[PDB]
Amino acid sequence: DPLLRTGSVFGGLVRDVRRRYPHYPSDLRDALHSQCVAAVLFIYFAALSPAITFGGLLGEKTEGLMGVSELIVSTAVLGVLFSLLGAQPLLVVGFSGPLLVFEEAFFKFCRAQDLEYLTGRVWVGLWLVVFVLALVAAEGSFLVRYISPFTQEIFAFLISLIFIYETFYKLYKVFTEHPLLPFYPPEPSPRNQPNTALLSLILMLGTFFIAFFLRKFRNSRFLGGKARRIIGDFGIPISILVMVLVDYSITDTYTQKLTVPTGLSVTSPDKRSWFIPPLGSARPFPPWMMVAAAVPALLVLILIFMETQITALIVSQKARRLLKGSGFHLDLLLIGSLGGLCGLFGLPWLTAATVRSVTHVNALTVMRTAIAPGDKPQIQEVREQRVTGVLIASLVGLSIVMGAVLRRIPLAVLFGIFLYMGVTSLSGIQLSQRLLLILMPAKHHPEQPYVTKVKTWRMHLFTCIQLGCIALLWVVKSTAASLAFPFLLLLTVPLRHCLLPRLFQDRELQALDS
Amino acid sequence: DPLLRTGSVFGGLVRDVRRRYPHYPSDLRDALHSQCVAAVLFIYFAALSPAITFGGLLGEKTEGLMGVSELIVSTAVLGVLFSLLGAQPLLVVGFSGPLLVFEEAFFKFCRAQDLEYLTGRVWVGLWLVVFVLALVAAEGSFLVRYISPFTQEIFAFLISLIFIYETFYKLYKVFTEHPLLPFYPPEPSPRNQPNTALLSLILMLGTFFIAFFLRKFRNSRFLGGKARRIIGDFGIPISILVMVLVDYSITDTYTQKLTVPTGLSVTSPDKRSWFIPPLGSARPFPPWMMVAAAVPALLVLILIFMETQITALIVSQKARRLLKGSGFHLDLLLIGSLGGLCGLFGLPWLTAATVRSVTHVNALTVMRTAIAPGDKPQIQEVREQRVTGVLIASLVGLSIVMGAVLRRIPLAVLFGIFLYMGVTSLSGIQLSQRLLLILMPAKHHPEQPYVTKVKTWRMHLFTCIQLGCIALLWVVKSTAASLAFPFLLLLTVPLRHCLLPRLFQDRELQALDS
């Protein structure tokens, strides 16, 4: 009962510490295996590239005050500290879309009112620290009890679908940068190049298909059991290596490759330094802004709380075989305090990433080797340890000096890897199965509890409502009112607890939503 | 059984006629279905393109005396006549590699000795007619009882493997014609074009994958039974149409498309006409050549007999559920007589095609709709009829006036179709399963009779001998002694009946070889 209220200050934090910390030597010792190396290799690539993309976007939005080096430093430090001290070290922290939206909105507001951006960020971070401390001290993290699988399913489905859409849009942009022309006259990034878009498409599709086939090879009957396990664990590194070697042989064609800043320096050394004074550098900071910085801090608190808590709920489901324990009070305090203290040095705030954390958990799952003939395998265990997260964060931080190795990797392989991640993230959601059941005839449906106890036409209405909510949320995100997206999602909790009981019966709701 | 000897002249032919002809109205009536249209559409494309390729090669070899129009006319006429009068109308006649080798060798011999090529062909055809008549009149087609599944498996495996190899070599040649260059300066088929090789590869792979996925969609549970059957039957036409539309939308890049001669005319109107005089056109024909033309007639007879009878054996296996009957004496007489009479008009000889006939039979197989869950489907029936063969031959003959429609179809789609055909032709051979069983561990082998009654290491030696024979035959085909390939295959019949019993026991041989 981790969500019960105890009635004493900081009770949940003490309970989480006492529950999780004694397992520390086991956490250190569980990392001696060959699967952990493959997980590290996969998640390092899964986590490095979004940092570069969001750093480029952030540098574009904020006129070069924050860029790629700041994001890399923040990711490395926060990931190392969280994996060393967190109660759930399987979460992966990073940047996200809503954080970028908030940063751009706050930059516009600061520019309009003739205020300094970084000092405002400092005061926002201080207020966020105060609010998070006050929330944790009152055991305010027990409201996660009211987040039903309704909201979790909506959130996960929307996030994964958006992930896939952005991957396909990134592929599409190349076909407009390097179009297919009749004539290519002979001649500062290159533009209008031959054989580039088609080669990128081929590399992406090849990486995705090799990864998928190697993953399917695990459950086959060829070769020995040990060889099958070893080859299946290293499927994605093998795909990446094979496609990189294929691309390396063809040297006539231009392909875009990874770029990483060299050296540990701030993006704009002329404008700012590493430490941002809280009282103003060139101008005095007005006290009214110091007092009024609470509202953006409130918005950041709501965003971080929603994202982190929903991700922790999704990761710690009962069907995923999580044993050592979960922390709902310690992780929130760590993330909030570190984010608030990051404001002093001009670094962006971070939150737990849903797809990255789910992929990290999936990479460490060990299935039963005694697969029943013609039966879907069942999870045997999950390797709980802290070494992989620390290693991933350290590699992300250390990538600034490994530019020579990284400049040999094209982006299409990463596109294929992202496509595989997004596709495999959608197979763990009940909404996906209930959505596939629409096409199938009513007599082939499985023996799930929402099929036997619920009429066929009363189960499709639930899916219709969920899809309507997902579409409304996506539409709101796409328009100029995206800053209200974290609030609107929070409005699906009353909907399940105030309006759904008026339509569905209790016995139908208990089996449909569980 | 049709392979017994009766002891009276033309006994087998009379028995075949009396067995098959009464089913004629059923043969006409069984063609009223939607699957027959899909079969016609698939096999028309499967049969048209090899005619064009072999016509080009034949025109290259024989200095324009025989080309594409002659091959098209011969294919159309012989296919129509055979499908109207044959005892097994599911065979598809056409040209093949060994026939091309014999034609080139005979052309070289005629050029060396200063003789006319077409008159020599006329006399060779007359001697072939005489030999085939003498062979049939003595019930000489009872020796097919000695062709064990050993030889049939070797032949089918070699043919399909060569098919796949030629498809991949054609793709490689496409790559070599239009290389990937750094610069493409602007300046008789086009050469050194951009975006051609990669687009051709993409079209081939897309066609193959769409066809495979639509074939797999048949056994799923989505949609109704009628919709599943209809979509599965038309999988290959749908793939072709989709990829043709995809290629048609992109109008910037050059891709090679089907070319077909226009009009019904001989390839070289100056050199020759439609009728070849048997006594010599410009020079008297020496009688010694007339007498001595028997040896090439013997070679042609051996080739046609072997390949046609092995194809008829493969098609009429007991596991394929053939009901109406088979003809081993009527088909040989028809093919031999038509080939011999083709010499007078300067047309090439034809024989049954193994891959084409197997594909035609597969396209007409109806499986049981009551598929057991998690079980391989069982064949329900095969549609026996004469309409599809006549329609395919008529379409092949008529394609000389449909050039406008055909000039919009690229060759990469046909490459993908050929790849699918060659891949699906290898799944009906026991050698394929026994070759896959090498990789699997000894405890996962199925309950086939060659697993229970034969030791594991004594069933791998059989496969090793078969693979050695296949490799030796391929090596012989590749070198300059390819003209002896039909003989060497015929030497595998004594090997199974004189030497294999000295190694294997009767119990092992009876289960390993049917």
Side-chain angles (χ1 to χ4, degrees):
Chain A
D1 47 356
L3 293 173
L4 268 182
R5 186 148 198 257
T6 81
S8 55
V9 289
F10 289 110
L13 188 140
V14 175
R15 290 197 303 170
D16 286 335
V17 167
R18 264 177 209 161
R19 186 163 43 235
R20 183 56 192 236
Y21 268 48
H23 295 86
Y24 214 85
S26 176
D27 272 330
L28 288 183
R29 260 201 296 272
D30 270 32
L32 277 34
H33 201 267
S34 59
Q35 201 175 10
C36 299
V37 185
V40 163
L41 288 175
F42 180 26
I43 307 301
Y44 166 61
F45 283 117
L48 169 69
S49 35
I52 286 166
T53 305
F54 280 121
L57 283 173
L58 197 58
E60 274 173 23
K61 300 304 179 84
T62 65
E63 283 184 8
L65 284 181
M66 313 213 308
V68 186
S69 55
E70 278 93 321
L71 193 42
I72 282 175
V73 165
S74 187
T75 299
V77 175
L78 294 212
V80 163
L81 281 171
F82 181 80
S83 173
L84 275 178
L85 299 177
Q88 181 71 278
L90 290 176
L91 298 184
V92 172
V93 305
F95 215 63
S96 62
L99 293 169
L100 181 54
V101 172
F102 176 82
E103 292 277 15
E104 100 191 350
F106 192 61
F107 171 76
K108 260 151 40 193
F109 173 80
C110 278
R111 182 56 61 87
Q113 231 63 21
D114 223 349
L115 296 170
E116 290 183 353
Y117 176 49
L118 302 162
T119 317
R121 278 178 48 82
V122 163
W123 288 107
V124 163
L126 291 180
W127 275 106
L128 168 66
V129 152
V130 166
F131 282 158
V132 155
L133 211 73
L135 169 67
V136 163
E139 301 164 68
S141 295
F142 83 101
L143 306 164
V144 195
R145 173 226 299 180
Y146 297 121
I147 299 179
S148 52
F150 195 76
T151 307
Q152 305 169 31
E153 260 145 43
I154 285 174
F155 184 72
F157 202 82
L158 183 63
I159 292 307
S160 294
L161 207 58
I162 285 165
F163 198 70
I164 295 168
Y165 171 72
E166 317 283 347
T167 297
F168 272 126
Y169 188 87
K170 281 196 287 188
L171 174 65
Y172 151 82
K173 219 66 193 132
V174 188
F175 264 95
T176 49
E177 270 163 26
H178 302 296
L180 304 199
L181 297 174
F183 276 111
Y184 283 109
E187 298 292 326
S189 64
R191 256 191 156 250
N192 292 317
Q193 297 287 324
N195 309 320
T196 300
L198 294 170
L199 189 62
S200 303
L201 170 67
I202 283 173
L203 290 174
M204 169 168 180
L205 287 187
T207 306
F208 174 72
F209 279 132
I210 296 181
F212 203 80
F213 290 168
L214 267 186
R215 141 199 194 90
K216 247 55 208 163
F217 174 74
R218 256 193 326 241
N219 321 293
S220 73
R221 277 129 65 261
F222 305 92
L223 273 72
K226 294 184 183 180
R228 264 188 272 145
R229 290 166 211 170
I230 293 206
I231 296 184
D233 292 353
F234 283 81
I236 292 151
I238 280 169
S239 293
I240 292 168
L241 183 70
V242 162
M243 230 63 210
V244 164
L245 284 181
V246 163
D247 156 79
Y248 168 77
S249 59
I250 323 179
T251 166
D252 311 79
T253 317
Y254 168 76
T255 47
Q256 222 207 336
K257 316 213 173 200
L258 280 171
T259 205
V260 176
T262 50
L264 187 63
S265 146
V266 65
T267 288
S268 301
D270 293 330
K271 296 185 187 181
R272 78 178 205 93
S273 61
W274 271 118
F275 173 75
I276 303 302
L279 250 171
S281 309
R283 307 168 191 164
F285 210 70
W288 73 266
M289 194 40 200
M290 320 213 186
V291 177
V295 187
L298 200 65
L299 289 179
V300 173
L301 161 70
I302 282 168
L303 200 173
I304 285 178
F305 184 92
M306 146 195 99
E307 238 282 13
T308 304
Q309 297 295 338
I310 294 183
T311 301
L313 270 185
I314 290 166
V315 166
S316 74
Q317 276 167 349
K318 198 86 55 183
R320 294 179 184 268
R321 306 273 200 301
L322 273 291
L323 266 39
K324 282 191 173 70
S326 61
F328 286 108
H329 297 84
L330 188 53
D331 297 351
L332 177 71
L333 181 80
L334 276 176
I335 283 176
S337 294
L338 293 179
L341 289 187
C342 278
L344 285 170
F345 301 103
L347 309 180
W349 305 302
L350 302 181
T351 185
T354 311
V355 183
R356 263 171 273 172
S357 315
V358 163
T359 293
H360 185 209
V361 171
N362 280 348
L364 292 173
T365 290
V366 182
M367 302 249 183
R368 295 188 188 275
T369 179
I371 320 159
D375 200 276
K376 168 150 163 243
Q378 36 156 12
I379 290 158
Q380 172 190 322
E381 92 186 347
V382 178
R383 326 191 82 107
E384 306 289 311
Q385 30 93 14
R386 297 181 186 277
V387 175
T388 41
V390 167
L391 281 180
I392 289 153
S394 299
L395 286 177
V396 164
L398 201 71
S399 75
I400 57 171
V401 302
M402 302 179 337
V405 187
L406 290 180
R407 87 185 37 150
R408 300 236 147 250
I409 296 177
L411 301 178
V413 187
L414 304 183
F415 291 173
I417 294 307
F418 302 156
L419 194 61
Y420 168 84
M421 278 179 25
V423 161
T424 54
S425 176
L426 278 172
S427 307
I429 309 172
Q430 293 194 357
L431 178 53
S432 297
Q433 176 65 257
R434 224 159 51 229
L435 195 63
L436 285 178
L437 289 190
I438 291 176
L439 317 161
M440 290 186 24
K443 65 216 209 43
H444 288 109
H445 293 177
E447 295 293 327
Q448 303 285 351
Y450 49 79
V451 182
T452 78
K453 303 171 180 29
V454 188
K455 299 172 77 175
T456 303
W457 75 275
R458 296 222 99 209
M459 144 173 138
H460 295 343
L461 192 138
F462 199 78
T463 312
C464 278
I465 287 170
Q466 281 193 294
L467 286 181
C469 287
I470 280 164
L472 198 299
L473 288 176
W474 200 337
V475 162
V476 151
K477 281 175 70 71
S478 296
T479 71
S482 58
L483 208 42
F485 164 71
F487 194 55
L488 290 196
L489 182 69
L490 229 49
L491 267 184
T492 64
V493 175
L495 178 84
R496 190 255 173 268
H497 283 94
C498 293
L499 270 35
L500 255 64
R502 277 185 173 91
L503 257 79
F504 292 84
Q505 303 276 279
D506 288 319
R507 69 167 327 252
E508 331 203 291
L509 271 183
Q510 168 165 351
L512 267 170
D513 163 17
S514 267
Chain B
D1 50 353
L3 291 172
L4 266 182
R5 185 148 197 257
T6 81
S8 55
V9 288
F10 288 110
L13 189 140
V14 174
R15 291 199 303 170
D16 285 335
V17 167
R18 270 185 208 151
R19 186 164 43 235
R20 182 56 192 236
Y21 268 47
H23 296 87
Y24 214 86
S26 175
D27 272 328
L28 287 182
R29 261 202 297 272
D30 270 34
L32 278 35
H33 201 267
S34 59
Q35 200 175 10
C36 299
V37 185
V40 163
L41 288 174
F42 180 26
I43 306 302
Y44 166 61
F45 283 116
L48 170 69
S49 35
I52 286 166
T53 305
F54 280 121
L57 283 173
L58 197 58
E60 272 167 14
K61 300 305 179 84
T62 65
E63 267 149 62
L65 285 181
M66 271 152 41
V68 186
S69 55
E70 278 92 321
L71 193 41
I72 282 175
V73 165
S74 188
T75 299
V77 174
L78 265 58
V80 163
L81 281 171
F82 181 80
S83 173
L84 275 178
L85 300 176
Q88 181 71 280
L90 290 176
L91 299 184
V92 172
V93 304
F95 215 63
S96 63
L99 292 168
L100 180 55
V101 172
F102 176 82
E103 295 274 27
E104 102 192 347
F106 192 61
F107 172 76
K108 260 152 40 202
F109 173 80
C110 278
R111 180 58 63 86
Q113 231 66 18
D114 219 352
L115 295 169
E116 262 152 293
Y117 176 49
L118 302 162
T119 317
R121 278 179 48 82
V122 164
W123 288 107
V124 164
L126 291 181
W127 275 106
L128 169 66
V129 152
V130 166
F131 282 159
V132 156
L133 219 62
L135 170 66
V136 163
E139 305 164 65
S141 296
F142 84 101
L143 306 165
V144 197
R145 81 193 298 91
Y146 299 121
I147 301 178
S148 53
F150 195 76
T151 307
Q152 305 169 31
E153 262 146 41
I154 285 174
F155 184 72
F157 202 82
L158 184 62
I159 287 326
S160 293
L161 205 59
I162 285 165
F163 198 70
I164 295 167
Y165 171 72
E166 322 284 344
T167 298
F168 275 126
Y169 186 86
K170 282 193 283 189
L171 178 66
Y172 155 83
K173 267 262 154 273
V174 160
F175 279 11
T176 56
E177 260 155 20
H178 299 295
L180 305 198
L181 297 174
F183 277 111
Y184 282 110
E187 297 292 327
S189 64
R191 288 177 66 96
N192 294 317
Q193 300 292 279
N195 310 320
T196 300
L198 294 169
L199 189 62
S200 303
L201 170 66
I202 283 173
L203 290 174
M204 169 167 180
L205 286 188
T207 306
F208 174 73
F209 278 132
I210 296 181
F212 204 80
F213 145 68
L214 270 187
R215 150 209 199 72
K216 253 46 208 153
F217 174 74
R218 255 193 326 239
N219 320 293
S220 73
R221 278 121 46 111
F222 304 92
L223 274 71
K226 293 185 181 181
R228 264 188 272 145
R229 289 166 210 170
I230 292 206
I231 297 299
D233 293 350
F234 283 81
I236 292 151
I238 279 169
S239 294
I240 291 168
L241 183 71
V242 162
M243 230 63 210
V244 162
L245 285 180
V246 163
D247 155 78
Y248 166 79
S249 70
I250 319 176
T251 54
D252 294 278
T253 312
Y254 168 76
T255 46
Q256 225 204 333
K257 315 213 174 199
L258 278 171
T259 205
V260 171
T262 50
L264 187 63
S265 146
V266 64
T267 289
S268 301
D270 294 330
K271 296 185 187 181
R272 78 178 205 92
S273 60
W274 271 118
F275 172 75
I276 303 302
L279 224 42
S281 309
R283 306 167 189 163
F285 210 70
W288 73 266
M289 194 39 199
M290 320 210 185
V291 177
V295 187
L298 268 176
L299 289 179
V300 174
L301 161 69
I302 282 168
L303 197 152
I304 285 177
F305 182 93
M306 149 207 101
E307 184 297 354
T308 301
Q309 296 294 339
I310 292 183
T311 302
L313 271 186
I314 289 167
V315 167
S316 74
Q317 276 167 348
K318 200 86 55 183
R320 295 178 184 268
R321 305 257 209 300
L322 275 291
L323 260 43
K324 283 190 173 70
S326 61
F328 286 108
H329 297 83
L330 188 52
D331 297 351
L332 178 72
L333 182 80
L334 277 175
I335 284 175
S337 294
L338 293 179
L341 290 193
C342 277
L344 284 170
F345 302 104
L347 309 181
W349 305 302
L350 301 182
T351 185
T354 311
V355 183
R356 263 171 273 172
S357 315
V358 163
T359 294
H360 186 209
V361 171
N362 280 347
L364 292 173
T365 291
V366 184
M367 299 255 180
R368 295 185 189 276
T369 182
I371 301 169
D375 202 277
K376 186 175 181 180
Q378 190 67 255
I379 287 159
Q380 173 191 323
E381 91 184 342
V382 180
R383 325 192 82 107
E384 307 290 310
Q385 98 270 162
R386 297 181 186 276
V387 175
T388 41
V390 167
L391 282 180
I392 289 153
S394 300
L395 286 177
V396 164
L398 200 70
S399 75
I400 57 172
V401 302
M402 303 179 337
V405 188
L406 290 180
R407 88 177 47 131
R408 299 216 110 81
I409 296 177
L411 301 178
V413 186
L414 304 183
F415 291 173
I417 294 307
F418 302 156
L419 195 61
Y420 168 84
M421 278 179 25
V423 161
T424 54
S425 176
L426 278 172
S427 308
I429 309 172
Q430 293 194 358
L431 178 52
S432 297
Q433 175 66 258
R434 224 159 51 229
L435 197 63
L436 285 178
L437 288 190
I438 291 175
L439 315 165
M440 311 183 15
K443 48 197 221 55
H444 288 289
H445 293 177
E447 291 85 4
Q448 316 277 11
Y450 49 78
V451 182
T452 76
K453 310 182 199 333
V454 187
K455 298 173 77 175
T456 303
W457 80 275
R458 289 224 108 201
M459 104 170 183
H460 293 345
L461 191 138
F462 198 78
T463 312
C464 279
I465 287 170
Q466 281 193 294
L467 286 181
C469 287
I470 280 163
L472 198 299
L473 288 176
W474 200 336
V475 162
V476 151
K477 281 176 70 72
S478 296
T479 70
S482 58
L483 208 42
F485 164 71
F487 195 55
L488 290 197
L489 182 69
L490 229 50
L491 266 184
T492 64
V493 175
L495 178 84
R496 190 254 174 268
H497 282 95
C498 294
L499 272 37
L500 255 64
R502 277 185 172 91
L503 257 79
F504 292 84
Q505 306 273 282
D506 285 320
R507 291 201 47 269
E508 327 211 286
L509 274 182
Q510 171 165 348
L512 265 170
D513 162 347
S514 280

